[PDB]
Amino acid sequence: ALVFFAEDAAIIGLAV
């Protein structure tokens, strides 16, 4: 899978 990063603060990984 891929992990996209985003600022939610703190940086989080979104798994796809």
Dump strand ranges (E) for 1-16: 3-7, 11-15
Q: Tell me how many residues contact Na ion (CB under 5 A).
A: 4
Smallest distance, Å, CB 8 to a second copy? Answer: 5
What's the CA gap between 4 and 12, in Å, rounded? 8
Given a contact cutoff of 8 angstroms between Cβ atoms, the answer to whether 4 and 14 are in contact is yes
Note whether 6 binds Na ion by CB under 5 A.
no
Contact letters for Cl ion, residues 1-16 (x by CB under 5 A): -------------xx-
Contacts to a second copy by CB under 8 A? 1-9, 12-14, 16
